[PDB]
C-alpha cells in the first residue's frame, strides 16, 4: 500500500519501548530466576558434599 | 539432614579415637602384667637351680 512516514513514527517507540525493558525489566528478572536456581542446585551440592 | 551427617562425621571419629586409645592402653597394660610374671618366673626358677 502507499507508504507513510508512519513507518518512521513507529520505529522511534519500538526501540524506546527496548531502550526501557533492556533495563528496567529482563536483568531484574534474570536474578529474580537465576536465585531460585541457585538456590536448589546449591542445596543438593552441599548435601552431597555432607554424605560423601 | 545436612547436619545428621556432620552429626555422624563427629561422633564416629571420636568413637575412634576412644577405642583406638583404650585397645592400646589395654595392650600396654598386658605388656606391663607379662613382664611381671617374666620376674616371677625367672627368680622362682632361681630356686629350683640352687636346691638342686
Known amino acids: 500500500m502507499n507508504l507513510n512516514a508512519t513507518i518512521l513514527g513507529q520505529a522511534i517507540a519500538f526501540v524506546l519501548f527496548v531502550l526501557f525493558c533492556m533495563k528496567y525489566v529482563w536483568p531484574p528478572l534474570m536474578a529474580a530466576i537465576e536465585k531460585r536456581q541457585k538456590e536448589i542446585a546449591d542445596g543438593l551440592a552441599s548435601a552431597e558434599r555432607a554424605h560423601k | ?52
Open chain 2, 1 to 52: 539432614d545436612l547436619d545428621l551427617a556432620k552429626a555422624s562425621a563427629t561422633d564416629q571419629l571420636k568413637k575412634a579415637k576412644a577405642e583406638a586409645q583404650v585397645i592400646i592402653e589395654q595392650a600396654n597394660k598386658r605388656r606391663s602384667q607379662i613382664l611381671d610374671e617374666a620376674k616371677a618366673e625367672a627368680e622362682q626358677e632361681r630356686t629350683k637351680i640352687v636346691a638342686q
